[PDB]
Design an enzyme around this catalytic site. Structure first.
Site, mmCIF file in Angstrom:
data_model
loop_
_atom_site.group_PDB
_atom_site.id
_atom_site.type_symbol
_atom_site.label_atom_id
_atom_site.label_comp_id
_atom_site.label_asym_id
_atom_site.label_seq_id
_atom_site.Cartn_x
_atom_site.Cartn_y
_atom_site.Cartn_z
ATOM 1 N NE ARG A 1 -41.088 -96.303 -46.555
ATOM 2 C CZ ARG A 1 -42.599 -96.498 -46.929
ATOM 3 N NH1 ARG A 1 -43.409 -95.477 -46.940
ATOM 4 N NH2 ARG A 1 -43.155 -97.712 -47.146
ATOM 5 C CE1 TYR B 1 -37.638 -97.238 -39.502
ATOM 6 C CE2 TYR B 1 -38.573 -95.996 -41.534
ATOM 7 C CZ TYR B 1 -38.330 -97.202 -41.019
ATOM 8 O OH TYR B 1 -38.173 -98.397 -41.606
ATOM 9 C CE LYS C 1 -37.495 -97.640 -49.070
ATOM 10 N NZ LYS C 1 -37.655 -98.711 -49.943
ATOM 11 C CG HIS D 1 -39.701 -100.676 -53.568
ATOM 12 N ND1 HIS D 1 -40.766 -100.737 -52.864
ATOM 13 C CD2 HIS D 1 -38.411 -100.929 -52.690
ATOM 14 C CE1 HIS D 1 -40.368 -100.992 -51.410
ATOM 15 N NE2 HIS D 1 -39.068 -101.394 -51.297
ATOM 16 C CB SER E 1 -42.688 -101.369 -47.267
ATOM 17 O OG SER E 1 -42.396 -100.610 -48.274
ATOM 18 C CB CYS F 1 -44.575 -107.548 -49.428
ATOM 19 S SG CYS F 1 -45.998 -106.649 -48.879
ATOM 20 C CG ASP G 1 -35.374 -101.335 -50.419
ATOM 21 O OD1 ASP G 1 -36.547 -101.781 -50.158
ATOM 22 O OD2 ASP G 1 -35.147 -100.237 -50.484
ATOM 23 N NE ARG H 1 -37.421 -101.604 -41.881
ATOM 24 C CZ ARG H 1 -37.843 -101.741 -43.181
ATOM 25 N NH1 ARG H 1 -37.039 -102.117 -43.869
ATOM 26 N NH2 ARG H 1 -38.880 -101.454 -43.268
HETATM 27 N N1 LIG Z 1 -45.438 -116.289 -45.346
HETATM 28 C C1 LIG Z 1 -44.358 -115.950 -45.909
HETATM 29 N N2 LIG Z 1 -43.902 -114.746 -45.325
HETATM 30 C C2 LIG Z 1 -42.659 -114.159 -45.805
HETATM 31 C C3 LIG Z 1 -42.263 -114.786 -46.906
HETATM 32 N N3 LIG Z 1 -41.242 -114.108 -47.140
HETATM 33 C C4 LIG Z 1 -41.005 -113.013 -46.232
HETATM 34 N N4 LIG Z 1 -41.927 -113.407 -45.330
HETATM 35 C C5 LIG Z 1 -42.192 -112.338 -44.090
HETATM 36 O O1 LIG Z 1 -42.672 -110.924 -44.627
HETATM 37 C C6 LIG Z 1 -41.720 -109.991 -43.764
HETATM 38 C C7 LIG Z 1 -41.123 -108.989 -44.780
HETATM 39 O O2 LIG Z 1 -40.051 -109.681 -45.164
HETATM 40 P P1 LIG Z 1 -38.849 -108.642 -46.034
HETATM 41 O O3 LIG Z 1 -38.372 -109.292 -47.053
HETATM 42 O O4 LIG Z 1 -37.796 -108.256 -44.932
HETATM 43 O O5 LIG Z 1 -39.804 -107.209 -46.507
HETATM 44 P P2 LIG Z 1 -39.242 -106.477 -47.380
HETATM 45 O O6 LIG Z 1 -40.168 -106.774 -48.494
HETATM 46 O O7 LIG Z 1 -37.784 -106.439 -47.774
HETATM 47 O O8 LIG Z 1 -39.668 -105.171 -47.204
HETATM 48 P P3 LIG Z 1 -38.745 -103.656 -47.201
HETATM 49 O O9 LIG Z 1 -37.225 -104.160 -46.660
HETATM 50 O O10 LIG Z 1 -39.265 -102.691 -46.119
HETATM 51 O O11 LIG Z 1 -38.625 -103.144 -48.580
HETATM 52 C C8 LIG Z 1 -40.838 -110.965 -43.210
HETATM 53 O O12 LIG Z 1 -40.870 -110.448 -41.656
HETATM 54 C C9 LIG Z 1 -41.217 -112.511 -43.324
HETATM 55 O O13 LIG Z 1 -41.534 -112.888 -42.114
HETATM 56 C C10 LIG Z 1 -42.720 -115.757 -47.569
HETATM 57 O O14 LIG Z 1 -42.170 -116.239 -48.589
HETATM 58 N N5 LIG Z 1 -43.845 -116.474 -46.858
HETATM 59 O O1 LIG Z 2 -40.144 -98.809 -46.178
HETATM 60 C C1 LIG Z 2 -39.326 -99.760 -46.930
HETATM 61 O O2 LIG Z 2 -39.510 -100.173 -48.005
HETATM 62 C C2 LIG Z 2 -37.739 -99.915 -46.411
HETATM 63 O O3 LIG Z 2 -37.751 -99.659 -45.245
HETATM 64 O O4 LIG Z 2 -37.074 -100.687 -47.108
HETATM 65 MN MN LIG Z 3 -35.908 -105.251 -47.187
HETATM 66 MN MN LIG Z 4 -38.169 -100.895 -49.311
#
Ligand SMILES: Nc1nc2c(ncn2[C@@H]2O[C@H](COP(=O)(O)OP(=O)(O)OP(=O)(O)O)[C@@H](O)[C@H]2O)c(=O)[nH]1
Ligand SMILES: O=C([O-])C(=O)[O-]
Ligand SMILES: [Mn+2]
Ligand SMILES: [Mn+2]
Ligand SMILES: [Mn+2]
Length: 620
Positions: free
Chosen positions: A85, A233, A242, A262, A284, A286, A309, A403
């Site tokens: 983004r 993207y 979004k 979100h 994001s 996280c 999401d 992704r």
């Molecule tokens: N240390 C740690 N890392 C984590 C944990 N959960 C997820 N991660 C890392 O954080 C990164 C983000 O994970 P996602 O859950 O896919 O990200 P998201 O919150 O869905 O972000 P968006 O999809 O963009 O909205 C991943 O690559 C994981 O490796 C956790 O519980 N502990």
């Molecule tokens: O940017 C973000 O949070 C996504 O791609 O879900």
């Molecule tokens: Mn996600």
């Molecule tokens: Mn997101």
């Protein structure tokens, strides 16, 4: 009705009929067909035959490759300048600036970018005239939410990228049946173009059509229009995610009286037969997707996924806050996804999944950092830059924001009410971000007003989903900083007003931090499946168990209140350490941020919580 038949695009329709389209739908199609001048017009029907012909087309244009190791999976490699983004090129057009962002007291607004109609017209006329020359304009009729449900919203996306059409088929519910459900109703007008009219003046990197210099994603809520140019993207081109379901939907939710957030939605079941639904707002990259698809390490607990999401929530007649996932698939981050961290994700992405910017193995598989699977001898890796890659280089083989795009119905733990038009009752709300120090593992808000303040005070390290660099700790209130559709000060008042509704069953509010580090630089909490231990404590707190302890920041678990059996070596003194020196600086940064950014649109009750927290901390 015409003098030269110069506005009749019937002779250019290679699938469908303009006559079959509703009145306002046809006006939107032919109007932009006259502006962008496409060679053909393709009215999508969502069928399997259409999806197959999109894949064959993209495969013959060198846009995607077939991953022969899996069943109907495809890899796409994009221009390295078109990977995430662009918050700096995402603008909201309203009559008054105060309708979009609170007028700052000193600096510029971080709560969104506002652009006047006059300035947007000059930008629009400098981009879209003739941008689809030699390309096909696809008409995507999609639905956000269960089709036919009264709470669903229908949109029409015009795009010249079949990569967008294929992804929209996964991420939304699109096809002919959506046109029959719309009739003469209202719809969201979505227009997208890659910005490379034929013949190509610039050579394309990895056959990825994009115009980075002129990228612009604009939202006009007063006109229910989303106009996006230059990027491909998903966050910029899949306009129903979004741009629609968060930014535009948040303003509509303010008007009509609901919420567009979100947040993930998960249901969790305990060994006693009870099941509750929670929602978690993390920024994001996280942890939302890993939490919603979590495989618990506690025996007798089950986690089922409703969404990961975007959530649309509204109080029902009985006072319960009910939530639906308006999406149809998952658009998740690839690096870090392994069998040990997210095994339910690995099962899902093995078929009917479109990957973007991950690495490819010589035997037809995918590869990325943190996959934690060794390869057989003789297997070579091709990085996302379409080059030979060795494990002893510096460039990673996959992009940090690469992704996967996979259907939600294939998830093994998908919740049996993820398509119910009535929603699931939310009993808890979780906030959290990446805080390497100071913030404890989990704590609970003192009230609804304190909880709103906790979400408003969220901070986290920068991630790869935007253009931010340096891992600098930034503010990200409600994890909605890049997605606010209207004035954030009014946003805060909209949340606080829910405590006034009759017979309102307000959920509890928690704040978690999986990312606290020690003095060595490593994490103090294993996270992933072990986060079920934190969710177990939340489940009991909702049932009314007396397992909390009062601290100056909220309720924390008592001693021996968390199930730590199987760990033991965890340093609980640092996972819940509340340093007065840390929180005295933290409240100052929150004070300076809210005073500058929200200024005169800050609700008094948010200021009262800031004052109360500052007093409780000074008494330590
Ligand atoms: N240390 C740690 N890392 C984590 C944990 N959960 C997820 N991660 C890392 O954080 C990164 C983000 O994970 P996602 O859950 O896919 O990200 P998201 O919150 O869905 O972000 P968006 O999809 O963009 O909205 C991943 O690559 C994981 O490796 C956790 O519980 N502990
Ligand atoms: O940017 C973000 O949070 C996504 O791609 O879900
Ligand atoms: Mn996600
Ligand atoms: Mn997101
Ligand atoms: Mn009040």
């Amino acid at each position: 009705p015409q003098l030269h038949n110069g506005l009749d695009f019937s002779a250019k329709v290679i699938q469908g009929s303009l006559d079959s389209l509703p009145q306002e739908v046809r006006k939107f199609v032919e109007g932009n067909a006259q502006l962008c001048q496409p060679e053909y017009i393709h009215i999508c029907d969502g069928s399997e035959e259409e999806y197959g012909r999109l894949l064959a087309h993209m495969q013959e244009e060198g846009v995607i490759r077939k991953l022969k190791k899996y069943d109907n999976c495809w890899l796409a490699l994009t221009d390295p300048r078109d990977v995430a983004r662009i918050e700096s090129k995402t603008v909201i057009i309203t009559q008054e600036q105060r309708d979009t962002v609170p007028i700052p007291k000193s600096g510029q607004s971080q709560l969104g970018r506002w652009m006047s109609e006059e300035d947007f017209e000059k930008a629009f006329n400098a981009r879209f005239p003739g941008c689809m020359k030699g390309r096909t304009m696809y008409v995507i009729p999609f639905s956000m939410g269960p089709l036919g449900s009264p709470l669903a919203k229908i949109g029409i996306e015009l795009t010249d990228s079949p990569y967008v059409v294929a992804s929209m088929r996964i991420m939304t519910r699109m096809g002919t049946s959506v046109l029959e459900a719309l009739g003469d109703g209202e719809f969201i007008k979505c227009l997208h173009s890659v910005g490379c009219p034929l013949p190509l003046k610039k050579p394309l990197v990895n056959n990825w059509a994009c115009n980075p210099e002129l990228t612009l994603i604009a939202h006009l809520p007063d006109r229910r229009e989303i106009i996006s140019f230059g990027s491909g993207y998903g966050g910029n081109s899949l306009l129903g995610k979004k741009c629609f379901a968060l930014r535009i939907a948040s303003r509509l939710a303010k008007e009509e009286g609901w919420l567009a957030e979100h947040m993930l939605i998960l249901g969790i079941t305990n060994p006693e037969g009870k099941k509750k639904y929670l929602a978690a707002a993390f920024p994001s990259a996280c942890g939302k997707t890993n939490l919603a698809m979590m495989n618990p390490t506690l025996p007798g607990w089950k986690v089922e996924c409703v969404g990961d999401d975007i959530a649309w929530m509204k109080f029902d007649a009985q006072g319960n806050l009910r939530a639906i996932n308006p999406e149809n698939g998952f658009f998740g981050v690839a690096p870090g996804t392994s069998v040990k961290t997210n095994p339910n994700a690995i099962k899902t992405i093995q078929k009917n999944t479109i990957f973007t910017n991950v690495a490819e193995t010589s035997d037809g598989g995918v590869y990325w950092e943190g996959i934690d699977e060794p390869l057989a001898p003789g297997v070579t890796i091709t990085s996302w830059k379409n080059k030979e890659w060795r494990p002893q280089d510096e460039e990673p083989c996959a992009h940090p924001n690469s992704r996967f795009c996979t259907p939600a119905s294939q998830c093994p733990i998908i919740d049996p009410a993820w398509e119910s038009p009535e929603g699931v009752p939310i009993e808890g709300i979780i906030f959290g971000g990446r805080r390497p120090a100071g913030v404890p593992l989990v704590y609970e808000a003192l009230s609804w007003q304190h909880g709103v303040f906790v979400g408003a005070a969220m901070r986290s390290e920068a991630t790869a989903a935007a253009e931010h660099k340096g891992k600098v700790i930034m503010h990200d209130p409600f994890a909605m900083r890049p997605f606010f559709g209207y004035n954030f000060g009014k946003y805060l008042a909209h949340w606080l007003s829910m405590a006034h509704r009759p017979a309102a069953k307000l959920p509890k509010i928690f704040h978690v931090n999986w990312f606290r580090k020690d003095k060595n630089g490593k994490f103090l909490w294993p996270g992933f499946g072990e986060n079920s231990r934190v969710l177990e404590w939340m489940f009991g707190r909702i049932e009314g168990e007396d397992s909390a302890k009062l601290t100056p920041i909220g309720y924390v678990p008592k001693e021996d209140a968390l199930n730590l059996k199987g760990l033991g070596d965890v340093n609980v003194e640092e996972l819940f350490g509340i340093s007065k020196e840390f929180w005295e600086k933290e409240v100052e940064e929150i004070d300076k941020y809210l005073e500058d950014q929200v200024n005169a649109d800050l609700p008094y009750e948010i200021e009262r919580e800031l004052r109360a927290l500052k007093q409780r901390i000074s008494q330590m």
